[PDB]
Amino acid sequence: PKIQRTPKIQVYSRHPAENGKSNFLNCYVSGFHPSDIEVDLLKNGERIEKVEHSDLSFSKDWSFYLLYYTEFTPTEKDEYACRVNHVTLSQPKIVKWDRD
Amino acid sequence: FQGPTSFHVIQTSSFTNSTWAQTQGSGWLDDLQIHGWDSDSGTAIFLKPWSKGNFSDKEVAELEEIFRVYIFGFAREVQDFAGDFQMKYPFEIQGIAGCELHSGGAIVSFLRGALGGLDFLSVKNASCVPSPEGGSRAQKFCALIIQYQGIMETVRILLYETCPRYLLGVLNAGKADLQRQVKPEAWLSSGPSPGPGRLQLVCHVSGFYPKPVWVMWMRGEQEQQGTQLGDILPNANWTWYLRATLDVADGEAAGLSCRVKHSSLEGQDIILYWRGSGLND
Numbered sequence: 001p002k003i004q005r006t007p008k009i010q011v012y013s014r015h016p017a018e019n020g021k022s023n024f025l026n027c028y029v030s031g032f033h034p035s036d037i038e039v040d041l042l043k044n045g046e047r048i049e050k051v052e053h054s055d056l057s058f059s060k061d062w063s064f065y066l067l068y069y070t071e072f073t074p075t076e077k078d079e080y081a082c083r084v085n086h087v088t089l090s091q092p093k094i095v096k097w098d099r100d
Numbered sequence: 101f102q103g104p105t106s107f108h109v110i111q112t113s114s115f116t117n118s119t120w121a122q123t124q125g126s127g128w129l130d131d132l133q134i135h136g137w138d139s140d141s142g143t144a145i146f147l148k149p150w151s152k153g154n155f156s157d158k159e160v161a162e163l164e165e166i167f168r169v170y171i172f173g174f175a176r177e178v179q180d181f182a183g184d185f186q187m188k189y190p191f192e193i194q195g196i197a198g199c200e201l202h203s204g205g206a207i208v209s210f211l212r213g214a215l216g217g218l219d220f221l222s223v224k225n226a227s228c229v230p231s232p233e234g235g236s237r238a239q240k241f242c243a244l245i246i247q248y249q250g251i252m253e254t255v256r257i258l259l260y261e262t263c264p265r266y267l268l269g270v271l272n273a274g275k276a277d278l279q280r281q282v283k284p285e286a287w288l289s290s291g292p293s294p295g296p297g298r299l300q301l302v303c304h305v306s307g308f309y310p311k312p313v314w315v316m317w318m319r320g321e322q323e324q325q326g327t328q329l330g331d332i333l334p335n336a337n338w339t340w341y342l343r344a345t346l347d348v349a350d351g352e353a354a355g356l357s358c359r360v361k362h363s364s365l366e367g368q369d370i371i372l373y374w375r376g377s378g379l380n381d
């Protein structure tokens with residue numbers, strides 16, 4: 001009962017990105033152990049306050065997973081990211097959203 | 101019938117030190133959450149109007165109390181025995197228990213427990229079975245647990261008598277949501293690929309329910325065996341997202357299309373055509 005597993009972090013939009021059209025940004029954080037984890041969604045490096053998330057669950061191999069999501073409106077230059085901290089990580093891991 | 105065929109409850113109990121532990125719990129139809137556990141009240145949160153199935157409020161309340169008592173006593177007893185079981189803090193215990201409806205109508209129940217992310221025990225035939233990864237610690241636990249009055253008989257009743265009727269009642273009560281058909285939307289994008297003159301084409305498929313789906317890169321009628329399916333990722337509100345990718349040499353992308361088949365489409369497959377030279381949306 002001893003090896004810790006680092007989060008996999010996957011960022012994606014609910015709909016194809018169209019600049020100026022409302023959408024949903026998803027961050028799926030999975031494969032980690034233990035369950036204690038901190039997750040933010042970022043807009044231009046600043047934390048988004050109205051972010052929802054799922055209740056804790058886990059996979060057959062007992063690794064935990066969570067879904068974080070927020071409404072967002074993509075634009076040409078704005079940047080969105082998912083920022084995760086976990087015991088396996090020495091500092092927060094930021095994973096930027098990318099359309100293509 | 102389509103949609104989920106199983107119900108389970110999960111527990112995650114996090115032990116920080118000898119005097120602090122916290123448990124999280126929930127109830128699920130396959131991947132779809134239908135119950136939460138409210139630690140503020142020691143009662144369940146019913147996420148759908150039909151989450152109680154065909155159970156009476158009395159039996160639902162009685163079940164909430166069994167879980168509340170169990171959650172408190174589990175932490176209490178794990179703390180008391182942690183010294184004998186040579187436990188080092190912090191550690192985390194997981195459990196899952198439930199039942200599933202199989203083809204041909206049989207309902208099969210299960211209970212599995214984990215320590216440190218590794219299998220620790222299971223219940224087979226209303227009996228505690230230690231798992232090999234759990235080592236002698238799990239052999240000690242199973243021999244301990246079966247001596248506490250009531251525990252094994254309550255597990256036996258819940259697994260093999262309560263769960264199957266609960267499962268059948270809730271799959272029926274929830275059929276309007278559980279068996280609905282939601283159509284996916286699909287779109288194409290082109291990613292980078294290593295090595296000279298190589299492209300990766302991506303076919304995104306998002307917003308479908310139920311979960312089974314078929315996505316393939318095609319040249320005319322020829323399904324491209326190089327199609328690689330990503331993991332099925334969740335959306336909010338009970339739909340899924342899936343990417344199917346194809347690695348192709350630069351001058352061989354033209355002529356490719358992505359074909360999506362889904363139960364909701366009533367035989368009208370989605371077909372997207374890759375166009376070259378940037379003539380894509």
Ligand SMILES: *[C@@H]1O[C@H](CO[C@@H]2O[C@@H](C)[C@@H](O)[C@@H](O)[C@@H]2O)[C@@H](O[C@@H]2O[C@H](CO)[C@@H](O[C@@H]3O[C@H](CO[C@H]4O[C@H](CO)[C@@H](O)[C@H](O)[C@@H]4O)[C@@H](O)[C@H](O[C@H]4O[C@H](CO)[C@@H](O)[C@H](O)[C@@H]4O)[C@@H]3O)[C@H](O)[C@H]2NC(C)=O)[C@H](O[C@@H]2O[C@@H](C)[C@@H](O)[C@@H](O)[C@@H]2O)[C@H]1NC(C)=O
Nearest residue numbers: 153154155156159207261263264265266267268269270272
């Ligand atoms: C919530 O729903 C459950 C699922 O069934 C639902 O209810 C039925 C009526 C329909 O609405 C379905 O659409 C729906 O899915 C209920 O559980 C089921 O209850 C029925 C009784 O209504 C019960 O049928 C009985 O079965 C026994 C045989 O059972 C044994 O053998 C079978 C294999 O053959 C095995 O699968 C079982 O597990 C057992 O090992 C049979 O002897 C009974 O016959 C008697 O009654 C009938 C009249 O119904 C009569 O014609 C006969 O002549 C004889 O008197 C009867 O057929 C189902 O087995 C049971 N299913 C499961 C999986 O448990 C549930 O009902 C409640 O629990 C039941 C266990 C029983 O105590 C009911 O009285 C309870 O109300 C319902 N409610 C709750 C609170 O769970």
Ligand SMILES: CCCCCCCC/C=C\CCCCCCCC(=O)O[C@H](COC(=O)CCCCCCCCCCCCCCC)COP(=O)([O-])O[C@@H]1[C@H](O)[C@H](O)[C@@H](O)[C@H](O)[C@H]1O
Nearest residue numbers: 166169170173174177197198228249250251254258263266
């Ligand atoms: C909303 C719809 C929901 C649908 C739900 C559908 C079904 C879901 C499917 C499966 C659920 C399975 C998991 C259930 C877990 C709780 C069972 C239980 O023990 O109930 C509890 C028994 O008591 C305790 O646990 C007290 C603390 C003792 C130590 C506990 C350590 C447990 C370690 C082993 C765990 C692994 C398990 C064992 C592994 C081998 C609570 O039951 P009770 O308070 O009604 O009492 C009981 C009660 O009073 C009895 O009447 C009496 O006879 C008895 O003596 C007493 O103890």
Ligand SMILES: *[C@@H]1O[C@H](CO[C@@H]2O[C@@H](C)[C@@H](O)[C@@H](O)[C@@H]2O)[C@@H](O[C@@H]2O[C@H](CO)[C@@H](O)[C@H](O)[C@H]2NC(C)=O)[C@H](O)[C@H]1NC(C)=O
Nearest residue numbers: 034036037087114115116117118119120121122189190191
């Ligand atoms: C056992 O631990 C708790 C602390 O709980 C956690 O501690 C950290 C490791 C981290 O996981 C935090 O997020 C948790 O709070 C101790 O309780 C704390 O005690 C200190 C002072 O003693 C107090 O400031 C905190 O408020 C307490 N925590 C809470 C949640 O109120 C407890 O003392 C520890 N027990 C022993 C014997 O060391």
Ligand SMILES: [Cl-]
Nearest residue numbers: 044045079081
């Ligand atoms: Cl950012």
Ligand SMILES: [Cl-]
Nearest residue numbers: 088089090091
């Ligand atoms: Cl790092």
Ligand SMILES: [Cl-]
Nearest residue numbers: 103104310311
């Ligand atoms: Cl499904």
Ligand SMILES: [Cl-]
Nearest residue numbers: 141142168172
């Ligand atoms: Cl309580």
Ligand SMILES: [Cl-]
Nearest residue numbers: 139142168171
């Ligand atoms: Cl509680």
Ligand SMILES: [Cl-]
Nearest residue numbers: 153154269270
């Ligand atoms: Cl039910």
Ligand code: NA
Nearest residue numbers: 119120121175
């Ligand atoms: Na405690």
Ligand code: NA
Nearest residue numbers: 293294295296
């Ligand atoms: Na390249």
